[PDB]
Each structure stands twice: as structure tokens, then as C-alpha cells.
Design a protein around this ligand. Structure first.
Ligand SMILES: O=C1NC(=O)[C@@]2(N1)O[C@H](CO)[C@@H](O)[C@H](O)[C@H]2O
Ligand SMILES: O=C1NC(=O)[C@@]2(N1)O[C@H](CO)[C@@H](O)[C@H](O)[C@H]2O
Ligand SMILES: *Cc1c(COP(=O)(O)O)cnc(C)c1O
Ligand SMILES: *Cc1c(COP(=O)(O)O)cnc(C)c1O
Lengths: 830, 830
């Protein structure tokens, strides 16, 4: 059937009876009233059974051996569905396929019923998910820590061409994967004040909110390791949230509990944008406070909570603990770790600081200013008074370090301050992270260089040793074997299965680049993939596309820096050329643009309306026929990504050079047989570098060119004046060609494009359509297109998260990865 | 061990491995980290497994045979713990006891970990629970319908002698008994307006709240019948509760969902008191609207949703459906049933009315005016506009009936109106229920007579056939076999086990009233019970009592009509007499008073403070010694009741004649070997009537005497003037003898007692202490005390809820009870 594992005789039988056990005993249903959803759960519960045994021994293992623990703190974990992924990592896919088949059910149909764990916005969230899978696969004692939002990223609906947001009630029918652990609930404080008494400061008169943990298993790839993702839920105490007496109402008191529990209710839908709302800050301290107590408790036990030197010496803390800050979101971990060590454990400042710096590491994910976290002091002052005091003290000592290093450099002092003066004082969270971490890394080579050269230049001059780079990657399991079994099978037929946990072995595919059978096969799976997606489209969304055309897709969050607008300009150009010479042949294309716009991002939502507007015109022009289709992919999410990417021919990664930190979608397309048209931005550079620029479609300004233009000054009118095709499009938008009933509908876009384009869309227009002509030319030659594809696939190995994690492990965490199978799952009951 | 069933060889082994399966696979724990709470859940899950098989066949059964369905609507279901009860009804108690013993665990210790399902306030709620158990035991196709509050009756805490209320988060660790059924969610409307168009009225522009059902199994006693209790939870739709666009905030929109979900958040803690809050009314319509849709859907299928006459003829609706209104709380079912039939199904008014009256039955539970539901018209007008219109139309037609029957009786017209004019117009829910139900019943013989003679006199004259009586009862299973296995065993040793489902057989115990061994045994279990409670007291609450004293207990909600105050006056009297003649012998007593006061009931909370105040003085007077102890039983609830009642010697049922509708606690004490000192109120009359007044301690005014006094006019000063002992107590309260630091602390009680005593406490004082002297005298003669006890126990059979239900079944529902074992639980998988 494929190498989705063995469909053993004893195990298919075993699976079937356990499916029935759960359908009866767990679901309390009988075959005569069971619906596909019930069947999905019976299976989910059956699959989940297979990894509890391993989950228990893994955790017990780490307790016995006591290795250095890795704590990945992130406010986002974009997990997606987990049934198939679990089958794949446990080698259960074929057995389950067989068993459910024998039970008369279609496994694929049941898999489609599982709701996505949308606890993320995009790249940052998904990176965390891929990292978790890799950390498990590399046998690291790692824990993912975050917030269990009851509402994930909103579900996008397109009404009249506009995006409509609606709550993602992903828990509505329950989550068979999580395990509530009420017994490990912890208290988290807010507000209050600071009392300075005799021997130390005291955080007093605080409001208490409780943190209830929920553990989700994270299985490694076929190694019997099952790590843990712990997600905190907010709960109100039953005392004060009722007991602070003297009139108000008993009923009201109980109803008001949903005020402390609002902390974990919803994920902020912002991607690469900072919103200084109090609720956000609370979510940030909430996950940090709760996680740290869990971390220290585990440390207090270790082998110190037995003997060792005997005296809670936190000197070995860094040797046993490593906490990775996914961006500045969990930044409060630094002043919180200090607070506990100093205020509660009573360590001297300097010893506590040494410990903190040595266990904390920070990862930066963007350089755009509006994405930077700068919290107003008055907010921290009211909500976390002691933390503010600690931050000021950290600042005081840090700046003294700077003054001593750069005597008389008074401007450098204000520039490096964690505290920013002005309208309202703010705290630069990024500066805090750098000062309190022993390592700061970027997510792509150019991004990392930019940090050193620009944004964090002064910090780099101060401590050059802190700055590193760790190019992002993606997990080959979900992003290849799971979403594209067809491609994975033909690759395995030639080079084996060892590449799934060793993606570098894909290079061996280079020697089949002239193999006639392979070229035919690679081309076949892509055709099968395109047909399946073309079908899904009519199935779930309804209104035809042509599977023979080039599948031009751009899927990612909607941003001005991602330049979906530049993609739009090209689409309109193609249209206009066709209307000019109707009877001239052009390579057919289906351009699919999908992504979600943050609710408050007006421009982004305007762009979505533009895309649908172009489709309205283009898709109903008889002269165009089937040569050009414009489709907006609704509710783009992880599960949707697993469907489009394997069916894509052209991947669009056209951000303005220097704005996309790394990107990961680009890698997903490269490993799945799509060719990349993009700019020398983020990881695109390392991808072209790995496959060879000849096998990549690079165009536009480099970072240097962008800066040259800024010195000069960017004037869009110039481009409007010298390019008639560009002029024609802008005047089409301005006159209502794309919005008849509302002719001025797109005035904001035009206005912006001409007067305040921060991402110089016009500047890359000419080189973009010229480059698009080159991909069309190559698509006309199926054999050469497929051969270039094989060059990309065979050369994508570097982009696996196993590589990225192995580097974090060695160069930042100080631990050694291991591909050693944990001693089976085998029963056992001590 | 007792007749808690057989501890079979094959089943104890089977139990043990399933306990281990759940501890591993369900709880995801290993013996080395498992806590008593984990062990409790493993067992709970193991026990729950045994009744799903039966649950499924019972429900399937009713679907095949299609008998008349009984729907018990109540806003309260006081269930208590359900682990032991389930073991008892499935004959699993000994097997589980053995198995857990072999696993090295104490079952009793694990049972104490289960949280109480406190979805009730007291009597009314508990009656519903006992009814459910009886309906299952009598094989009725019955369904309990209510609200799944996430916070039940508050947990009472005594701080400085004052009651402190704190949220009852009973779901904190989960509920292994319920089964969420998201797939059967239903929509419920609120607000909106009424449009009168061409062919009918339309309820329009309504706010939608969703009702998610949760089913809990209700097993019959050893008959393999497992009925269903369906509890609705409120959920916000994800559309409008987000989709009603045009600024407000996306985050805020999601946070505001907890506004529609507040409907099922908390139970109103009022007992025998009406609070016209909007949230209450919403909870009332919510449970009614959701339940009715479920009822009609089931009816639409039946055997009509196949063939029959073919044409949705609701003429057979009454023949297939019966809905019992537990008080006036679910009264809106009447106008709602009309609304659906008329507005949606399009039946003519008269046909719809005939159907409604024929399927609805109402049960009254109190005659005190402040407990009567009278909803302001402006509230119904805004929240349920169409229902108001229907109620007015019902009223219009009903009054026309009256006018025709009593021509010219204009005062009778206004008196009988469902609409009450005055300050603000109100709707008398009780009048609505009578008009729209074919049967109205009281809960005790005298209570029922009072309804006919007083409160509903005019309605009785109009339709005398509607009025009936159904004396309350309690379930012998939980209230005897479960809480008192020792007594149940010795009874079984003599007369067998058939009395558990046939309590009348207890009469056969009369012939052992002179049996020397039996007297010794009955006396022994009561002593063992008293020792166990005396131990629990020091265990969980701490500060000694004497097990040799008479256990004088009064446990029920705190009310002025229950007269805990009268009990207080007696306690103080005993104290004063002892202080007068210290060296005179008196029968030792431990008087225990427990109960909860509604948060807003100032007097009730003042009484609790008085009780603790008396204990402070009395319990620390050296001259008193161990002859008199005053103890306030904290957090009185079902699980606490299962502990005190079996250890009681004297049961206090001293309400003012004519105010306690029936009472059920009184019955619990009678079946458990306690003697009753009480008034000729509620069911006390039928109890004394059954055991013989010689075996009862009756005192005080009868209803007649109370009325005579009211004609005359009640003047408490008179009693104060003629009784020096009474005078002494009042002056002790007035001067601070019981409240040194705050001498005027009890001015409200004294003031009330002397000037506004609605329940004439002083009037029954003399006859009360005189009567108390008689019980002390008899307690001095152990052999005669025990013989009178045997007379009560042997004569309590009439008070089983099986008898009550059998009467409802035959005289109101039109169904025949059956003690036929359902065809085993046996596997089966069609
Ligand atoms: O705030 C961000 N959202 C992202 O997706 C992001 N930063 O992080 C991702 C993971 O490092 C990057 O790939 C992406 O380029 C960057 O925009
Ligand atoms: O509102 C009420 N609360 C009660 O306990 C009550 N009415 O109903 C119970 C069950 O019918 C009665 O036993 C009780 O006497 C009555 O007060
Ligand atoms: C991989 C992924 C992303 C990141 O895409 P980029 O192109 O790096 O912005 C965003 N959303 C989803 C659903 C993803 O799978
Ligand atoms: C039986 C019961 C009641 C009713 O007691 P009465 O004496 O009828 O008021 C109230 N509370 C609990 C916990 C009960 O078990």
C-alpha cells in the first residue's frame, strides 16, 4: 500500500476490537447510531492508547537518568490535526487503514473530521510545533510550555468578497489527545504592591489566578520517545473570588469568576504586529509564572532532592535547565527567574543574575518596528510592580557595563537602555532578552546578519559572543510523509526510508536526475496531487479549476510586506495581455492566493477584497476561457496547507528583501516538488544557495538595492511614469474597472501604492513579470521543469528541523541529540 | 461481609484488571505516582463500565417497544455522590470491596473522595433524585430533565461563628458519570419581537443561545434498567456572537460569549423563597425550550415517524407523552408547548390546548406567599414576548370559563386571574400551571387539603377533579442500604432482602418487637453508628463529643418556619436548669443543628450565629461537663446527611403547623432508628398515623389552633409575661449573656420574636420542653426506647418513593409500574 508500516495480522485484529471497545464503553454508542464523528473518536482513542505506555516510560526515564531539560516557552503552538501524525510516528498508518477498512470505514474520511489545534497565527507558531516533533525525534528531554486557549485563530469566512471572522471553538466536541492535570494546578499573582522589609522585598496584596495544566503527548519518529507539551488554563480561586466580603451579590461574585479565566480564553490574532493590551501582558506573565514554578519544582527533586552537595545550590541550575524564549513574548521569564531566586530563595543578586543569564536563550523572529514589544511602564507598574523594580535594576547594572566599555559614549547609553523615554516611557522587551540571555539568534543567515549590522548593532559590539544564527527548518514527517505519501514512496523505492530522520540523504536523488522512470514518477505524483486538490476544491468549496494549468500559489498571512499586492499586479497584467491579443497562446495558470488578515488590519482586509475582486472579473471573462483563474483559498490553516502545498507547481515567496526573517512555507514547497519564484530574502537565499541559482527563479532588489533606494528616496510616480502596463493597471483600479458598483472602493490601495508604499511594490514589478515569463517558458518543457524540480527536492535536506534542533542542542543548550530507540513500549506496571 | 452482593471469583479478578486498565490508559498514571484521588477515578471508571451495556439496551428497548414516556422537569436534582449507589443497584459492592482490598486499597477511603452533585437546595431537589431512582426501579420509561450548573449549592464555611459562602466547583476534577452529547445541541431563543403575518404570528429577531445536553445514567435497583438524566449546558453560537458586525472589538466579542453561557453557570441558592431576577427566568425558559424540542423529536419518530395514521396527528401526543412540572419553575412549558403546536405545527388553538392540558401535570411544594412565583409582566414582555401573548390568551379563555360557571361573581374573576394587577402587573405562575394541567397535587395529605381549602379554593370549586395528593417518600436504597448497611443486614437476617424494593414488608418486623436478640441488635447498630459519627467529627472537624449521650439532631435548611430558634430556646433552657441545680442528674445530650442559609437571608444567618454562640457558652462551662454539648454541623449536604441520620436518636421536625408541605428528612430519620419529636405538620401526621401516636412525640398547636390564634391575634408578650423560664432566656439574649463583646448582637432576633414572629415560636414553647422531658424519661429506659424505635422502623414502609411513584404512575401518568428484570446486560453489538 506504501511504507505506512506493516499491516500485521495480530495487530489489525487487536486494533479492531479496541476500536469497538471505545465505541461502546467510551463513546457509549452502538453501530446503529454511530456517525462518522463517533468513528473518528473511537479510532482517536484507540491510537492514543498506543502511546500512553511509551509516554509513561519516557517521563519515568528522564526521572531516573535525570538529563538536562529543555523548556521551549512560546505563546503559540500551531499543531494542526494529530491523528495521522501519531499513526505515522508510531508506524500505525497501514494497520489502522486495514482495520478500519475491515470495519467498513474509510480512514481518510474520518481524518477529515478532526479539528485543527489552531493555537498559533502562522510561522512562529508552526515553527514551535515542528521543533517539538524534532526534539522528540532527537531524543531530547524537552517540554513545550504554553497557553491552552479555548479559542484559537479565528476561522475565516469570505462574505461578498470580504473576510468575516468567527470564533474557533475547537474544543466543542472535546480533545482526545490532552490529559487535564488538575492536581498540578499552580497559583499566579497579579497587581498588589511591594513591601521592603528588613530582609528583602515582598510582593503583597496580590490577586490570585490559578493555572491548571493539560498535557499533550509529542511522539518522536519511530523511536518510542513521547515528550510532553504542557498547556496552562486559567481558573479562578473559589475563596477570594467569592470571599472578599461586604456586599456585591453572591450570584454576581460567581459570575465574575469569568474575569480571571478570560486570561486563557482567546489567542491574539496578530502576526508580526504588537498590540499593547493588558489582557496580552497578563497572558504573557501567566504562562511564564506558572511554567517557572514547574521548572524549579522539577529541579528541586532531580538528584539534589536526594543528596548531591546538599544545600539547595542553584549553581547547577544552568547545568540542568535550559529555557528557550520563542521571541520576546515569554520575556518576563528573565525578571521572574530573578524575583524567585532573589526574593524567595534569597540568593544574592549577582549569583542569581549569573544563573539566569546562563539558563536563558532568546530567538528573534522579525525586524519590522511595529512587531517589536515595547510595554508602557504604567502598565507594568500596576500589574507587576516588583518586576518593574527588577527590570530597572537590571537596566542600571547593564548600562554601567556599557559606560565602562564605551566611556563618554552618551548616545549609546540611551540607545541601549531597556527603558525608552518619550511620550510614555516603555520597556523594550527585546533589549531585556539580550541582556539576560547567553545566546541570541536569528532565524536565517541574512536575518541574523541584519540583527548584528542593524537592529542590535550596539549589543553585538558589547558582547559579540552572544549572537548566533539557526536557520529555520520544517519537519519532514508532517511536511512530506504525512501530506505527500506518494512522493515519499517513490523516493523510498530508490534510496530507502532512512531519509525521514536524515533528510540530507535526499542528495542521493541527484543521481536519478536523468533517470527516465524517476522523472516520469516525480511528474506523476504531482499530477495525482493536483487532481486530488482540484477535486477537494469542488467538493468542499465548489466552482471548477483546470488541473492541467500551472498551479501558481501564494499562501501565508496577509501582510503588506509579504506583497500579495505584487502578486495581484502580475495577475492583472496577465489578464490585460490576454485581452490585448486573445488568440495568442499563453501557458494556462490557476493562481491561488490564501491567507488570513488580522481583524484590525484594514489594509490587509482591503487586499483580500482586491483578490476576490480580480477573480470576479477574470473568472467570468469568456475571452480568457480556462487560461487564467484567480482563486482565493478560504481559511488557510495547517490542515489546508497539507493539501495545497503538495499540489503546487510555483511557490511565491516575494517579500521585500530584508523583511521576511526566514519563512518556512518556502521550505514546505521546495520539499514537495514546487519551483520557487522569489526574492533574495530570509531563507530563500540559503535555498537557492543549496539548489543552485540556476534552479531557482530569483528576481528583484537585494537588501543593498533597497537601502540605496532609501538613501535616494523612493518615489513610486517614477515607475508609474515609465511603465505603461503598470500605469494601465493603476488606472483600472482607480476607475472602478474592478469595482463597478463602488468605483472608489480601492482608493486606499492606490493612494498607498503611490504615496506611502513602505515595501516598494512598484520597484520590483518589472523584474517580477519578466521573471514570471521565464517560469512559463520552462513549464512548456515538462521534462526540464521536472528535472529542475528533482534538483530542488534532492537539495532541500538542509531545511529539516532536525538539523536546526541539532544545532540549538549543541551550540546553545549544551546537549547531544540521539537517535536511540527508547527500550520499547512494553507493558510494565511497577 | 453483608448482603452487598457476591464477591465472585471470576468477577473480582475481572474488576481488578479493569481497575488497572483505567489507571494506566485512562488516568495515564503508574502505581508509583497514583494518589487516592486517582484510585477513586480508576474505580469510578471501572464501575461506570458495568452500566453502559445496560444503558444502551434500556434506551434501545424503549425505542423498539415505544411505551409512554415520562418527563420529569425540574430546575433541581440533588444527586449527591454516585459511586456507591451504583455499586448497590448493580450488586457490585462486595466484589469491588474485595477487589480493591486485594489491590491494597480501602474502598471507603476512596468513596470519600467523590464530590457531591449539589445541583439542588434541599427537599425539592432531593425529591427529584429519589423519584428518578424509583422510576428506574419501577421500570418506567422516564427522563429527568434539568440544568447542568457548573456551580451547585455553595459550600458553607463557618468563620467566627458566621456562615461564609464559597463556590462549589464540583467539576474541577471532572465528572466520570456524565456523557457530553454535543451532537444533540439545540437552539433556544430570547428577546426579539412578534410579527403577525397572514397565516400566523412569528417570533422574530431573537438572540440565540445553544443548549448542549449531558446524559447521566440512572440505574434501577437490581433490574438492569438504566434510565437517563439529561442536563442542559448553555453555549454561545459562534456566528452572531461574533458576526453581528460594525466595530466593538474581535477580542471583546469572543470574551462576551460568557454572557449567554452564564445561563447555566450557577444554581440560585434560595429554598422556599422567590427572587424575580432575569437570570432565573432565563434559566427557566432555557431548560423548558430545550427539553420540549427533545420531547417532540422523540415523538415524531416513535411509530408515527414510520406510519400509524400518517399525518403528524398530535392527538396521540398525550398517549405517548407525560410531562411532570416539579413546582412552578418549569411552568413556561405550558405556553411553550402551545407556541410550538400553534405557531410552528399550525394546530388550531383548541386542539393544541386539549393536547397541552392532557400531557401536563403540576406538583405544588409550598403554601408560604414569599415562595410563590409571580413574574413582572415587563420582564416577560421583553424576554419572551410571544409567551406573554399566549398567557394572556390562556387567561382570557379561562376567565370566560369561570364567568360562565359563576355568573356575576366579579371578585372571583380577579382572584383567579393569571394576571395580578397592582404596583406592577405580575403573572401568577401557579395559576398558569393549574389551568394548563390535568392534575394538581400536594406532597402530603394535610398540605393537599390546605390547597383545596385555602390557597387554591376557587380552582378546586371550578374543577375538583384536578386536585389530588401524593405523599412524598424517600428511596430505601440510598437512605437505608447505602447509608446504614448494618441496620439493613440485621433486618435482612430476619425477613429477607425483598423489602429493599418492597418496603411495606418492614411490617413483618413488628413480630420481633419482643425478640430479645433483635432488640439487642437494633440497639447495637445504632451504637456502632453513633461511634463512627463521633469519630468522623473529630477526624474532619475536630473537638470531641460523647457517644453515650442522646443524639438530638435537627438538620435541614435554615428557615424561620423550620423554627431552629425554637430548638435554640430549649437548648438554653436545659443549660439554665443545669446551672440552677448542678448536682441533679439529667440525661446527657449532644444537640446537633446543621443547615445552610440562603446568602441574602439575614435572619437565617443571624440564627446560625446564635447557634454557634450558644455552643461557645455551653461547651465551655465546667459545671455542665459532658451532660450538654451544642454543635453546629458544617456544610450540611446529602453526603453529610448519609452520616448523621443513621447516628441520630432524636429527629427534630418542629415547623409551625401548616407551613412544612411534607418534609422528607423526617422520613429518613424514621427508617434509620431515630424517634421523632414534632408537630402535626406535613408528613408528620401520616407518620404518627402509621406508627401510632403512642410511638411518636407530638406536641404544639395543630393547624386549627394556629388559625384560632390568628383570628384572636398573636401577642408574644403574653407568653413572655406568664413564663419565667422564657423571660429569663430573652433577657439573657438581650443583655449579651451570649455575646459579651457585642451585647446588642441579637437585638434583631429578640425584636422579631417579640413583635413580628410569623411562626409563633413562643406559642409552642411550653408544650415543646414538656414534651422534651418525656423523651428524656424514655431514653433512660434503653429497652423501651429501642422497642418504640422498632415500631417506627417496622412501620415506615409507606414512605418509600416506590409507593409515591407507583401512585403518580397510575393516578396521573397512566402507566403501569413493573418490577421485571430487563433481559440481562449481556454484551451484544448489532
Ligand atoms: O512574528 C513572526 N511571525 C512569523 O511568522 C515570523 N516572525 O517567525 C517565523 C519563524 O521564525 C519566520 O519564518 C517568519 O519569517 C517571521 O515573519
Ligand atoms: O420549595 C420547597 N423546598 C422544599 O424543600 C419543599 N418545597 O419541597 C419538598 C418536597 O416536596 C417538601 O418536602 C418540603 O416540605 C417543602 O418545603
Ligand atoms: C508554514 C505555515 C506558515 C508560514 O508561512 P510563511 O510562508 O513562512 O509566512 C503560515 N501558516 C501556515 C498554516 C503554515 O503551515
Ligand atoms: C432530605 C434532605 C433535605 C430535606 O430535609 P427536610 O428536613 O425535609 O427540610 C434537605 N437537605 C438534604 C441534604 C437532604 O438530604
Amino acid at each position: 500500500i506504501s511504507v505506512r508500516g506493516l499491516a500485521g495480522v495480530e495487530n489489525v485484529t487487536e486494533l479492531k476490537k479496541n476500536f469497538n471497545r471505545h465505541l461502546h464503553f467510551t463513546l457509549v454508542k452502538d453501530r446503529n447510531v454511530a456517525t462518522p464523528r463517533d468513528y473518528y473518536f473511537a479510532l482517536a482513542h484507540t491510537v492514543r492508547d498506543h502511546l500512553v505506555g511509551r509516554w509513561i516510560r519516557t517521563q519515568q526515564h528522564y526521572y531516573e537518568k535525570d538529563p538536562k531539560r529543555i523548556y521551549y516557552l512560546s505563546l503559540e503552538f500551531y499543531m494542526g490535526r494529530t491523528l495521522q501524525n501519531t499513526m505515522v510516528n508510531l508506524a500505525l498508518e497501514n494497520a489502522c487503514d486495514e482495520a478500519t477498512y475491515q470495519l467498513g470505514l474509510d480512514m481518510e474520511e474520518l481524518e477529515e473530521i478532526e479539528e485543527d489545534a489552531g493555537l498559533g497565527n502562522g510561522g512562529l507558531g508552526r515553527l514551535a510545533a515542528c521543533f517539538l516533533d524534532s526534539m522528540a525525534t532527537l531524543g531530547l528531554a524537552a517540554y513545550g510550555y504554553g497557553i491552552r486557549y479555548e479559542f484559537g485563530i479565528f476561522n475565516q469566512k469570505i462574505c461578498g468578497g470580504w473576510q468575516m471572522e468567527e470564533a474557533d471553538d475547537w474544543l466543542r466536541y472535546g480533545n482526545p489527545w490532552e490529559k487535564a492535570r488538575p492536581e498540578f494546578t499552580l497559583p499566579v499573582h497579579f497587581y498588589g504592591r511591594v513591601e521592603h522589609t528588613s530582609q528583602g522585598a515582598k510582593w503583597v496584596d496580590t490577586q490570585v489566578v490559578l493555572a491548571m495544566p493539560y498535557d499533550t503527548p509529542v511522539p518522536g519518529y519511530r523511536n518510542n520517545v513521547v515528550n510532553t507539551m504542557r498547556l496552562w488554563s486559567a481558573k479562578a480561586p473559589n475563596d477570594f473570588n467569592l470571599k472578599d466580603f461586604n456586599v456585591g451579590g453572591y450570584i454576581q461574585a460567581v459570575l465574575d469568576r469569568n474575569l480571571a479565566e478570560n486570561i486563557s480564553r482567546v489567542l491574539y490574532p496578530n502576526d508580526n504586529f504588537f498590540e499593547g493590551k493588558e489582557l496580552r501582558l497578563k497572558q504573557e506573565y501567566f504562562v511564564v509564572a506558572a511554567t517557572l514554578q514547574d521548572i524549579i519544582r522539577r529541579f528541586k527533586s532531580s538528584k539534589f532532592g536526594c543528596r548531591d552537595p546538599v544545600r539547595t545550590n542553584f549553581d547547577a541550575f544552568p547545568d540542568k535547565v535550559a529555557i528557550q524564549l520563542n521571541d520576546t513574548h515569554p520575556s518576563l521569564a528573565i525578571p521572574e527567574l530573578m524575583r524567585v531566586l532573589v526574593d524567595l530563595e534569597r540568593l544574592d543578586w549577582d549569583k542569581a543574575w549569573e544563573v539566569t543569564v546562563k539558563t536563558c536563550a532568546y530567538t528573534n523572529h522579525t525586524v519590522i518596528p511595529e512587531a517589536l514589544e515595547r510595554w508602557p511602564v504604567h502598565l507594568l507598574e500596576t500589574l507587576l510592580p516588583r518586576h518593574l523594580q527588577i527590570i530597572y535594576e537590571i537596566n542600571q547594572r547593564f548600562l554601567n557595563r556599557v559606560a565602562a566599555a564605551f566611556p563618554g559614549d552618551v548616545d549609546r547609553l540611551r540607545r541601549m537602555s531597556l527603558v525608552e523615554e518619550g511620550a510614555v516611557k516603555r520597556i523594550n522587551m527585546a533589549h531585556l532578552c539580550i541582556a539576560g540571555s547567553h545566546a541570541v539568534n536569528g532565524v536565517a543567515r541574512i536575518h541574523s546578519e541584519i540583527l548584528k549590522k542593524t537592529i542590535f548593532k550596539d549589543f553585538y559590539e558589547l558582547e559579540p559572543h552572544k549572537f548566533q544564527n539557526k536557520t529555520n527548518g520544517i519537519t519532514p514527517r508532517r511536511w512530506l510523509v504525512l501530506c505527500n505519501p506518494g512522493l515519499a514512496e517513490i523516493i523510498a523505492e530508490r534510496i530507502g526510508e532512512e531519509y525521514i530522520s536524515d533528510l540530507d540523504q535526499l542528495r542521493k536523488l541527484l543521481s536519478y536526475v536523468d533517470d527516465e522512470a524517476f522523472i516520469r514518477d516525480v511528474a506523476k505524483v504531482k499530477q495525482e496531487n493536483k487532481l486530488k486538490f482540484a477535486a477537494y476544491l469542488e467538493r468542499e468549496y465548489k466552482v471548477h479549476i483546470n488541473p492541467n494549468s500551472l498551479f501558481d500559489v501564494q499562501v501565508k498571512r496577509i501582510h503588506e510586506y509579504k506583497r500579495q499586492l505584487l502578486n495581484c499586479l502580475h495577475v492583472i497584467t496577465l489578464y490585460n495581455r490576454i485581452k490585448k491579443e486573445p488568440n495568442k497562446f499563453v501557458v494556462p495558470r490557476t493562481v491561488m492566493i490564501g491567507g488570513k488578515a488580522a481583524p484590525g488590519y484594514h489594509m490587509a482586509k482591503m487586499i483580500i477584497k482586491l483578490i476576490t475582486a480580480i477573480g470576479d472579473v477574470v473568472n467570468h471573462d469568456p475571452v480568457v476561457g480556462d487560461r487564467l483563474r484567480v482563486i482565493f483559498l478560504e481559511n488557510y490553516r495547517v490542515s489546508l496547507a497539507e493539501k495545497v502545498i503538495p499540489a503546487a507547481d510555483l511557490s511565491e515567496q516575494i517579500s521585500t528583501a530584508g523583511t521576511e526573517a526566514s519563512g518556512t512555507g518556502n521550505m514546505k514547497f521546495m520539499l514537495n516538488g514546487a519551483l520557487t519564484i522569489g526574492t533574495m530574502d530570509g531563507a530563500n537565499v540559503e535555498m537557492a544557495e543549496e539548489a543552485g541559482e540556476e534552479n531557482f527563479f530569483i528576481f528583484g532588489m537585494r537588501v543593498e538595492d533597497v537601502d540605496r533606494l532609501d538613501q535616494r528616496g523612493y518615489n513610486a510616480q517614477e515607475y508609474y511614469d515609465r511603465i505603461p502596463e503598470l500605469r494601465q493597471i493603476i488606472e483600472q483600479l482607480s476607475s472602478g474597472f474592478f469595482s463597478p458598483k463602488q468605483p472608489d472602493l480601492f482608493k486606499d490601495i492606490v493612494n498607498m501604492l503611490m504615496h506611502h508604499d513602505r515595501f516598494k511594490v512598484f520597484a520590483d514589478y518589472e523584474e517580477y513579470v519578466k521573471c514570471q515569463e521565464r517560469v512559463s517558458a520552462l513549464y512548456k518543457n515538462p521534462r526540464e521543469w521536472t528535472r529542475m524540480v528533482i534538483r530542488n527536492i534532492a537539495t532541500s535536506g538542509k531545511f529539516s528541523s532536525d538539523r536546526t534542533i541539532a544545532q540549538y542542542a549543541r551550540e546553545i543548550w549544551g546537549v547531544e541529540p540521539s537517535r536511540q530507540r527508547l527500550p520499547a513500549p512494553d507493558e510494565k506496571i511497577p
